[PDB]
């Protein structure tokens, strides 16, 4: 999560 | 504790530049995810955006125009630039710390864990 | 969307509350609430449907799964009259529903 956005699809 | 404080400049006019920081206290910003929300007089919350430890941020599209979130990890803070401002645009502001994970396959979860206290932010003529 | 209802609960300290809201796609158990007093920044106050927030009073509870949910307050005490919103991961254009606020009745 700390680097690509885990709120994306 | 961990302990969020706004700071920065309230009062602007209309087509000035919002801009605030949030810094950090007692805590590590790795691991989480750092938001900006307002709250204008008698309505809801609103999520502005969300910068993670990495720099890459995300914006709500009704602000992505004139919105920037930034972050400086040595200094243990993170900003909102806003662009443009209008009336429109007077609310409270808060910094807060958002509690991430994965919930399923493609899942996540997402909690605003940590409020800051909050900077009053008028715009008008 | 979320969906909150009623808008206003009146009650009396001593009595059970309860507040719904209804997600309009499913969420999972990814629900939180948060409760807001006046002139203070809202707080979190249940996560991941059920679990309470760190130091959030055993009187607050929370269910659900996918698509309703409910918040419980067993016994209502003077300081929990206050606005209280759900949140249910990063849905936009409106990530907070629009809030029960629990009045006490008299």
């Known amino acids: 999560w700390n680097w690509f956005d885990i709120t994306n699809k | 504790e961990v302990q969020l404080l706004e700071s920065g400049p309230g009062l602007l006019k209309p087509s000035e530049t919002l801009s605030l920081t949030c810094t950090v206290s007692?805590?590590?910003?790795?691991?989480?995810?750092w938001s900006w929300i307002r709250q204008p007089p008698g309505e809801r919350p609103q999520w502005l955006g969300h910068?993670?430890?990495?720099?890459?941020?995300k914006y709500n599209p009704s602000l992505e125009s004139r919105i920037t979130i930034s972050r400086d990890i040595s200094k243990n803070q993170f900003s909102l630039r806003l662009n443009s401002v209008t009336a429109a645009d007077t609310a409270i502001y808060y910094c807060?710390?958002?509690?991430?994970?994965?919930?399923?396959?493609?899942?996540?979860?997402?909690?605003?864990?940590?409020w800051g206290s909050g900077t009053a932010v008028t715009v008008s003529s | 969307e979320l969906t909150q209802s009623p808008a206003t609960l009146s009650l009396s300290p001593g009595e059970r509350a309860t507040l719904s809201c209804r997600a309009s796609?499913?969420?999972?158990?990814?629900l939180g609430w948060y409760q807001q007093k006046p002139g203070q920044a809202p707080r979190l106050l249940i996560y991941?449907?059920?679990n309470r927030a760190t130091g959030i009073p055993a009187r607050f509870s929370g269910s659900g799964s996918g698509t309703d949910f409910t918040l419980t307050i067993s016994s209502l005490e003077p300081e929990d009259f206050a606005v209280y919103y759900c949140?249910?991961?990063?849905?936009?254009?409106?990530?907070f529903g629009q809030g029960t606020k629990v009045e006490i009745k008299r």
């Open positions: 796609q499913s969420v999972g158990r990814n």
């Open positions: 007692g805590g590590s910003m790795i691991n989480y995810y």
């Open positions: 949140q249910a991961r990063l849905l936009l254009p409106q990530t």
């Open positions: 991941d449907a059920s």
């Open positions: 807060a710390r958002v509690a991430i994970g994965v919930s399923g396959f493609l899942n996540y979860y997402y909690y605003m864990d940590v």
């Open positions: 910068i993670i430890y990495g720099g890459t941020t």
